[PDB]
Design a protein around this ligand. Structure first.
Ligand SMILES: CC(=O)SCCNC(=O)CCNC(=O)[C@H](O)C(C)(C)COP(=O)(O)OP(=O)(O)OC[C@H]1O[C@@H](n2cnc3c(N)ncnc32)[C@H](O)[C@@H]1OP(=O)(O)O
Ligand SMILES: CC(=O)SCCNC(=O)CCNC(=O)[C@H](O)C(C)(C)COP(=O)(O)OP(=O)(O)OC[C@H]1O[C@@H](n2cnc3c(N)ncnc32)[C@H](O)[C@@H]1OP(=O)(O)O
Ligand SMILES: N[C@@H](CCC(=O)O)C(=O)O
Ligand SMILES: N[C@@H](CCC(=O)O)C(=O)O
Lengths: 167, 169
């Protein structure tokens, strides 16, 4: 299995949404269409080569600061799991992270083994509320960035695990 | 065109240069932008390299996707010492190609540089701007149903009192 992983187009957003909706709830955070469209340039999709490039998976990398990214919304069609599509997507995202000149990537996930294959290690966060987080983000600049590591404080909504990768 | 520069995807390392370009024109000409905004939006940004000066960033531009069929051109800026040589146009050429690649159907822009954008096929349009507060209510409601009747390009607030222009791809 050699999925093609490529940058998303607006035309893939429906398939992305469908993927999210499959797992949305206590596993993945819900996303509406407008949110996805706006984020489209963060998104990569996996194609099924034998099936004419049909989209069977997705993932996103979101930039927080000059040195830090977060992987989000990685999902694979439940009928296509276990063939390396997932790992392919993550591989791509990490390369993008490198190309962008990021130094670290974090993720919030229940799939700790999956991510551990990529070198992610579980860390103990200091999560805050959404409100506190919004305060932090509003103040965020060079000075604040000196002492505040967003990877540690990013809210944990689903109650999953926090993991970190040093590029 | 004098300068046919390399136009490439932004990196986080480029953001200080981008910020410098924006701050050069910010206020009346361009909407200001802090570092955090820029970092988050980095993946929307393209930069123009000086062909001889160690690839130094001498221009920038971005495209922002609003909905399946619509995008907006933002924060296009060129080093003042390097203007009039085709860098601007090279940037916009790229953004427009990105738009097409993305499967956008239309692109808009809010600008004082009307002749510049007209070169790329943009025509002025009669906006019906709303307040920022209203625009935010609109965005919070936005979905397939609303998009049926509400064209965000007509209503996006005009902060700077410039011209509103549209391009059908
Ligand atoms: C921020 C976030 O997104 S949080 C992250 C997680 N997202 C989710 O939980 C959403 C719901 N879950 C899913 O969509 C999927 O189950 C995913 C994304 C977790 C995994 O997708 P999969 O496509 O099954 O992943 P992939 O197939 O690459 O790997 C799974 C197993 O297949 C096998 N496999 C791995 N690589 C390959 C390969 N190259 N070729 C063949 N088989 C492989 C391995 O046995 C592997 O197990 P591992 O997890 O121990 O490495
Ligand atoms: C959302 C938004 O971005 S709003 C719009 C853009 N932003 C701004 O206004 C920010 C401030 N302005 C700037 O940074 C610049 O002046 C820009 C971006 C508007 C123009 O950049 P430039 O690099 O000067 O663009 P470029 O050289 O391609 O400009 C073309 C003009 O200069 C002259 N010119 C351009 N290329 C050449 C060339 N190769 N040889 C000779 N003359 C040229 C032409 O007269 C042309 O006229 P036009 O304005 O009718 O097209
Ligand atoms: N990748 C993020 C979007 C990040 C953002 O643009 O805020 C998501 O899946 O929603
Ligand atoms: N491209 C926009 C940002 C778009 C966004 O909200 O992501 C800018 O010039 O900052």
């Amino acid at each position: 299995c050699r999925p093609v992983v490529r940058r998303a187009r607006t035309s893939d957003v429906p398939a992305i949404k469908q993927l999210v909706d499959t797992y949305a709830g206590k596993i993945l955070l819900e996303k509406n269409l407008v949110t996805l469209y706006e984020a489209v340039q963060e998104f990569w999709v996996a194609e099924h080569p034998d099936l004419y490039g049909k989209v069977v998976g997705c993932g996103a990398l979101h930039v927080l600061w000059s040195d830090l990214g977060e992987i989000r919304t990685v999902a694979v069609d439940p009928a296509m799991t276990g063939h390396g599509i997932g790992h392919a997507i993550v591989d791509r995202l990490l390369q993008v992270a490198r190309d962008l000149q990021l130094q670290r990537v974090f993720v919030l996930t229940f799939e700790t083994e999956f991510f551990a294959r990529h070198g992610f290690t579980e860390i103990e966060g200091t999560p805050v509320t959404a409100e506190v987080f919004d305060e932090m983000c509003r103040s965020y600049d060079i000075g604040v960035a000196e002492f505040l590591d967003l990877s540690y404080v990013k809210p944990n909504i689903l109650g999953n695990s926090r993991m970190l990768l040093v590029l």
